[PDB]
Amino acid sequence: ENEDFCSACNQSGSFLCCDTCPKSFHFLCLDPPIDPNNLPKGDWHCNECKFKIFINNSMATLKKIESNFIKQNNNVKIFAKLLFNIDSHNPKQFQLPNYIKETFNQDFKITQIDENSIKYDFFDKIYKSKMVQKRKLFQFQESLIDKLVSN
């Protein structure tokens, strides 16, 4: 029901005991710096607890709203999966990475592609092919010019 140490900042201090998860946080070790003596009245669901009761601990609706969320922001599309984990993330102190501290149904998966991506890929690859053949022709012309000059 409580933790002796803050699971976010990793030192002991004033805590807020969550209902389900035994981890507790400081008054600043939260996405928002909850103002002490001014904490909203209620059960005090944390971010993990609000993520579980938002999805009602069922996988189908959570994948469907995850796909809906990715559908909304296609401009940040490669990071769109990484925007989701954040919601289910309890903010914590920045612990350094370890290297920083120093000095089968999946085989036949059908790709779901769109028209605009096909357009971008076709344009990209034709421009690549056209200018690699153009630049190699220019390089061969320069090499032949140098060969005729040296001879």
Binding site: E115, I118, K119
Partner: protein
């Protein structure tokens, strides 16, 4: 010059007609 380059795809889609033939056309352009 630029306008035809950006307008080529959906004018090709308009010329194709049926959406299944345009789907196979995009499949061709992807396979390339």
């Amino acid at each position: 010059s630029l306008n035809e380059e950006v307008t080529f795809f959906e004018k090709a889609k308009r010329y194709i007609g049926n959406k299944h033939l345009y789907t196979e056309f995009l499949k061709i352009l992807n396979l390339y």
